[PDB]
UniProtKB/Swiss-Prot annotation, chain A:
The keyword Ion transport does not apply. It is a peripheral membrane protein. Keywords: Acetylation, Electron transport, Membrane, Mitochondrion, Mitochondrion inner membrane, Phosphoprotein, Respiratory chain, Transit peptide, Transport. This is Cytochrome b-c1 complex subunit 1, mitochondrial. The gene is Uqcrc1.
Swiss-Prot record, chain B:
The lineage of its organism: Eukaryota, Metazoa, Chordata, Craniata, Vertebrata. It is found in: Mitochondrion inner membrane. Belongs to the cytochrome c family. Residues 38-54 are mitochondrial matrix. It comes from Mus musculus. Component of the ubiquinol-cytochrome c oxidoreductase, a multisubunit transmembrane complex that is part of the mitochondrial electron transport chain which drives oxidative phosphorylation. Component of the ubiquinol-cytochrome c oxidoreductase (cytochrome b-c1 complex, complex III, CIII), a multisubunit enzyme composed of 11 subunits. The complex is composed of 3 respiratory subunits cytochrome b, cytochrome c1 and Rieske protein UQCRFS1, 2 core protein subunits UQCRC1/QCR1 and UQCRC2/QCR2, and 6 low-molecular weight protein subunits UQCRH/QCR6, UQCRB/QCR7, UQCRQ/QCR8, UQCR10/QCR9, UQCR11/QCR10 and subunit 9, the cleavage product of Rieske protein UQCRFS1. The chain crosses the membrane at residues 17-37. This is Cytochrome c1, heme protein, mitochondrial. Disulfide bonds: none annotated.
């Protein structure tokens, strides 16, 4: 595969600058930060989201629309996102523009300016959208599959936070989150595409060299009944192994075996925890039959796998998790997480080796370890009266 | 005592059955109740909340 290895050179502050040169002419230079809603302490539950809104509204060097203007003029796309564990600010731009794609990113992580005036507006923006964020039923289901599964922990609370905090937030608080969770050893400068690693390392030395230097799963159930909705969304999960756990790969193959309606499957991983399960949307009348169907399948893998199907699963995984030339953005993203989670970029050859070592016996062993006789977390929203209660799903978790 | 004996040749035996019976129910009831309380705890802990969209 002649994979372009990801050369990662570290910095004094610890930016762990990394890179994976590629022929593509445009590149994606991003900053990842190990800071999410898991690091918030319920008094600043929307600080990362609201800082993610404020981060493009001007820094000392780029007051007002300067930031957006320049990153617009250069012709680059500026994006940012926040999860429960990671925050990313990345720019897709013509490689030659690295010089500015990097200096701009430096401002966004440090020297940022949180104009109180702007703060006011972003508050309104976040709040109002949240007032409508309820339209994204799936996100709702998935932010309760989190609340009821991680009750009492910082992993239950959402990325956006409760409207309460959103309204009650001030520059100083933000400043704290910014000055507390934006440390240089918890930061990765990732570059993918037409970039040279030595030039990127010199730019990180020139700019960004200033950056300062028991989660538990609770088998439970939340049922939001609202019978006026046309469709019902139900998510059932168990405790995922984690990000670093080796068995994650044998679980991905299991998901590739499974693949009523919109019956997706997810393996969300956080630092030594996670949610492994399925989300499906169905007319109310069929919710119970779906559930029965789904539980039977998990059970099928646990006791009755087949090399053929495993193969089907290994192959789909193989065509997946490539993140290679899939594009600068995706690749950079993967590197961004790989340096934050694993501490290194796992190459695709190692992924292929870990895929080909998976057989049917260890797949049903790992599935029995993680699915069989486990207490799930259930989150339902919509006409969910025929959704079975916890004893029936409890009993369907075993044969 | 004898006339009693004839009227119930199993006075003793019935009483042996009653002893073991007591013991058996004595172990089954508490346990069954416990289970009754496992499978009913789920509901007995259910917390309902009304959230009109308001």
């Amino acid at each position: 595969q002649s994979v372009p290895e990801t050369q990662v050179s570290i910095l004094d502050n610890g930016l762990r600058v990394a890179s994976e040169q590629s022929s593509h002419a445009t590149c994606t230079v991003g900053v990842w930060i190990d800071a999410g809603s898991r690091y918030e302490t319920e008094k600043n539950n929307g600080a990362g989201y609201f800082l993610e809104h404020l981060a493009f509204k001007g820094t000392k060097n780029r007051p007002g629309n300067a930031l957006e203007k320049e990153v617009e003029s250069i012709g680059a796309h500026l994006n940012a996102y926040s999860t429960r564990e990671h925050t990313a600010y990345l720019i897709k731009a013509l490689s030659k523009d690295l010089p500015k794609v990097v200096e701009l990113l430096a401002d966004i992580v440090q020297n940022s300016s949180l104009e109180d005036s702007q703060i006011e507006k972003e508050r309104d923006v976040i709040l109002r959208e949240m007032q409508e964020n309820d339209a994204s039923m799936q996100n709702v289901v998935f932010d309760y599959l989190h609340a009821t599964a991680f009750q009492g922990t910082p992993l239950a609370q959402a990325v956006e936070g409760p409207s309460e905090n959103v309204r009650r937030l001030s520059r100083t608080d933000l400043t704290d989150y910014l000055n507390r969770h934006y440390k240089a050893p918890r930061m990765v400068l990732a570059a993918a595409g037409g970039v040279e690693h030595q030039q990127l390392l010199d730019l990180a030395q020139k700019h960004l060299s200033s950056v300062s230097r028991p989660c538990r799963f609770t088998g439970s159930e939340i049922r939001h009944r609202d019978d006026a909705l046309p469709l019902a969304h139900v998510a059932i999960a168990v405790e995922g192994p984690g990000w670093a756990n080796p068995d994650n790969v044998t679980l991905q193959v299991a998901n590739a075996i499974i693949g009523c309606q919109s019956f997706q499957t997810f393996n969300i991983s956080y630092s030594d925890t996670g949610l492994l399960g399925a989300h499906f949307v169905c007319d109310a009348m069929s919710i119970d039959d779906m559930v029965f169907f789904l539980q039977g399948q998990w059970m099928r893998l646990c006791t009755s796998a087949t090399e053929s199907e495993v193969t089907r699963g290994k192959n789909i995984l193989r065509n997946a998790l490539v993140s290679h030339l899939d594009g600068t953005t995706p690749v950079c993203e993967d590197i961004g997480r790989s340096l934050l989670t694993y501490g290194r970029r796992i190459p695709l050859a190692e992924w292929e080796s870990r895929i080909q070592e998976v057989d049917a016996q260890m797949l049903r062993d790992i599935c029995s370890k993680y699915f069989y006789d486990q207490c799930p977390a259930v989150a339902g929203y919509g006409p969910i009266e025929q959704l079975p209660d916890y004893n029936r799903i409890r009993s369907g978790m075993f044969w | 005592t004898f006339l009693r004996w004839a009227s119930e040749p199993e006075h003793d035996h019935r009483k042996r059955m009653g002893l073991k019976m007591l013991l058996m129910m004595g172990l089954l009831l508490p346990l069954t109740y416990a289970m009754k309380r496992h499978k009913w705890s789920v509901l007995k802990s259910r917390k309902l909340a009304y959230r009109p969209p308001k």
